[PDB]
Amino acid sequence: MLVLVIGDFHVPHRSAAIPQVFLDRLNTGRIQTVLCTGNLCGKETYDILRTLAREVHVVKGDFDEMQGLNETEVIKIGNFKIGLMHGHQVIPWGDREALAIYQRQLDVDILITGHTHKLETKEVGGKYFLNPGSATGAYSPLVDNPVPSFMLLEINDSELTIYEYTLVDGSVKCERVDFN
Numbered sequence: 001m002l003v004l005v006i007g008d009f010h011v012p013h014r015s016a017a018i019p020q021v022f023l024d025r026l027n028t029g030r031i032q033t034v035l036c037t038g039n040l041c042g043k044e045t046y047d048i049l050r051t052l053a054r055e056v057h058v059v060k061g062d063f064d065e066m067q068g069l070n071e072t073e074v075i076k077i078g079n080f081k082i083g084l085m086h087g088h089q090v091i092p093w094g095d096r097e098a099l100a101i102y103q104r105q106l107d108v109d110i111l112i113t114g115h116t117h118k119l120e121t122k123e124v125g126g127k128y129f130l131n132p133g134s135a136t137g138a139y140s141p142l143v144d145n146p147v148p149s150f151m152l153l154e155i156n157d158s159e160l161t162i163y164e165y166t167l168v169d170g171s172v173k174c175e176r177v178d179f180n
Contacts, residue, residue, distance in 0.1 A: 001032055001077070001078065001154060001155050001156055002029060002030060002031050002032050002033075002152060002153070002154055003031070003032065003033045003034075003035060003077060003152065003153040003154075003155060004026060004029070004031045004033070004034045004035070004052060004053065004150065004151075004152055005035050005036075005037075005112055005130060005132040005150065005151040005152070005153060006034065006035075006036055006037070006049075006132050006135045006150040006151070007036050007037030007038055007039060007061070007086070007114040007132055007134070007135065008037060008038070008039045008061065008086075008114045008115065008117055008132075008133065008134035008135065008136075008138055008140075009039055009040055009041050009045050009134070009135050009136050009138065010039050010040060010041040010042075010045070010063060010136070010138065011039070011063065011138045011139045011140075012063055014138065014139050016134075016136035016137060016138045016139070017136060018048070018135050018136055018148070019148050019167050019172075021167070021172055022135065022148065022150065022165065022167070022172075023048070025165075026052050026150075027051065027052065029052070029152065031052050031053040031152075032053060032054070032055065033053055033055045033056075033057070033075070033077060034049050034052055034053045034055070034056040034057065034058075035057050035075065035082065035084050035112055036049060036056065036057065036058040036059070036084075037059060037061065037084065037085070037086050037087065037112065037113060037114030037115070037131075037132065038058060038059045038060055038061025038062075038064050038069065038086040038114065039061035039062070039063045039064060039086065039114070039138075040058065040061075040064060040066065042066075043066075046058070046066070057073050057075055057084060059071060059072060059073055059084050059085050059086055060086065061086040061088070061114070061115070062086060062088045062115070071085060071086075071089070072084065072085040072106060073085075074106055074107075074108060077153075077155050078155040078156060078157050078158065078159075079109075079157050079158045080108075080109045080110050080155060080158075080160065081107060081108045081109050081110070082108055082109070082110045082111075082112060083102070083103065083106035083108035083110065083111045083112065084112045084113075085102065085111075085112075085113055086113065086114050086115055087113030087114050087115035087116070087131070088115040090102055090113060090115075093115070093116070093142070094113075094115070094116045094131075094142075096122075096124065096129075099111060099113065099129055100124065100125075100127070103127055103129070108127075109127060109128065110127070110128040110129075110130060110160075111127065111128070111129050111130070112130045112131070112132075113129075113130075113131055114131055114132065114133070114134070115142075116131060116133070116140065116142050116143065117133055117134040117137075117138060117139075117140035117142065117143045117146040118131065118133050118142070118143050118146065119131055119132055119133035119149040119150075119151065119164055119166060120133075121151070121162050121164060121177050123179060128160065128179065130151060130153075130162065132149060132150045132151040133146065133147070133148075133149035133150070133166070134146055134148065134149065135148060135149070135150050136148055137149070137167065147166050147167055147168050148166065148167040149164070149165060149166040149167070150165050151163065151164055151165070152165070158180070159179075159180055160178075160179040160180075161176065161177070161178055161179070162176070162177040162179075163175075163176055163177075164176075164177065
């Protein structure tokens with residue numbers, strides 16, 4: 001019932017590594033599921049994700065060439081139907097009402113998107129909108145100083161806890177958000 005939410009690893013022609021402190025934490029997390037918003041650094045990243053959990057879901061980001069990734073996925077965890085997509089498709093970008101439109105078309109309680117490279121948890125009308133930011137703090141035109149980040153969710157029936165992990169000025173920070 002622990003879910004890693006992660007993505008936006010890779011931007012073409014730019015290098016950026018996952019912090020090793022993140023890898024060490026997640027390899028010992030007993031993660032049940034990975035929900036990945038896409039933009040992997042090739043098979044290397046997919047192998048990493050497959051070591052973290054038994055069940056891995058990855059959607060197609062705008063830089064992905066890996067064959068066979070779907071644009072959207074819906075996954076049931078606890079009492080939550082969870083929609084997953086990279087989010088560059090949601091126009092105008094990251095805009096609350098456009099996101100809400102996709103959340104209703106996918107019939108989900110939680111909508112997970114990326115593309116902005118800025119981690120954000122937001123409850124809106126009893127629906128949840130989650131963005132883990134970029135695991136590598138990768139470049140984005142939309143953000144000047146992105147930081148490496150990810151989310152762990154703890155789901156117990158209708159209980160939802162989000163742990164927001166970021167790497168700021170060389171030190172890890174975590175913020176816990178509780179929803180019931």
